[PDB]
């Protein structure tokens, strides 16, 4: 759904991303900025404070899987649905994750990206990344029923 220039803009920037580091930050930020999302991770332990959250081992671990999976989709930006079909279904059928959350995440992510990249995460790159996240959220919600 992205133009030639936006695809170039997304790929390039993802090159510089330590998926693990970003992954834990985003997942951690979700949990701090929208505390209700903590509803799916009662096992994860202490989520009592920004701090506890941010340094919790399971957040970071989980955050890594997520973005690892996110990374796999970047690769297939033209089959965004096909790719997340199995995940769409699992989040629905077993996790019972309101697709809304995927949207909170994409935004929190964009935030993380920007924080980390400063002046490099320009209006145009953000634009390209707003499309990607949205595309990802929709792909993951696609099998909800």
């Amino acid at each position: 759904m992205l133009t030639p220039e936006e695809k170039s803009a997304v790929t390039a920037l993802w090159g510089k991303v330590n998926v693990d580091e970003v992954g834990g930050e985003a997942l951690g930020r979700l949990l701090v900025v929208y505390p209700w999302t903590q509803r799916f991770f009662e096992s994860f332990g202490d989520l009592s404070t920004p701090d506890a959250v941010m340094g919790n081992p399971k957040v970071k671990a989980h955050g890594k899987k997520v973005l690892g999976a996110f990374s796999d989709g970047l690769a297939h930006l033209d089959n965004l649905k096909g790719t997340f079909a199995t995940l769409s279904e699992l989040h629905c059928d077993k996790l019972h994750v309101d697709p809304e959350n995927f949207r909170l995440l994409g935004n929190v992510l964009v935030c993380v990206l920007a924080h980390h990249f400063g002046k490099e995460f320009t209006p145009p790159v953000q634009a390209a990344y707003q499309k990607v996240v949205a595309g990802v959220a929709n792909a993951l919600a696609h099998k909800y029923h």
Binding site: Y34, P35, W36, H96, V97, D98, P99, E100, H145
Partner: protein, 141 residues
């Protein structure tokens, strides 16, 4: 903010709902689940099949709550505090879903009150559901 008129319209229409409310709650529910299927993510512990004791008992608790908000449209916060606590701290239902239920609630209303559902009552119930939604979501963070 619910002006006096709004308050008037709500109590008026709510009144007519009378002792149907609970079964009103139960249809609004069923309407959300079938129309907005994502909302079922919050109800995996429920038999969500038509006429469920669960849904009916639930639609019933919902209505009771609204009857309470209406009974106390001037102090929704304290009237609903107990429930804003539980919604923020236990159920943690994303706030987008409040709107979906407000919607199916309007639909339920519209279809059960052919006389009372004028443009101005419609307007008023809308503002009011929007308000309930807010009380309940006020303590989310």
């Amino acid at each position: 903010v619910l002006s006096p008129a709004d308050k008037t319209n709500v109590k008026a229409a709510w009144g007519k709902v009378g002792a149907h409310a609970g079964e009103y709650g139960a249809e609004a529910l069923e309407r959300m689940f079938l129309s907005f299927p994502t909302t079922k993510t919050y109800f995996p512990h429920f038999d969500l099949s038509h006429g469920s004791a669960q849904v009916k008992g639930h639609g019933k608790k919902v209505a009771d709550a609204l009857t309470n908000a209406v009974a106390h449209v001037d102090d929704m916060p304290n009237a609903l505090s107990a429930l804003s606590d539980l919604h923020a701290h236990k159920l943690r239902v994303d706030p987008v879903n409040f709107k979906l239920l407000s919607h199916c609630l309007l639909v339920t209303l519209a279809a059960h009150l052919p006389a009372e559902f004028t443009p101005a009552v419609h307007a008023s119930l809308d503002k009011f559901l929007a308000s309930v939604s807010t009380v309940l979501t006020s303590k989310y963070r």
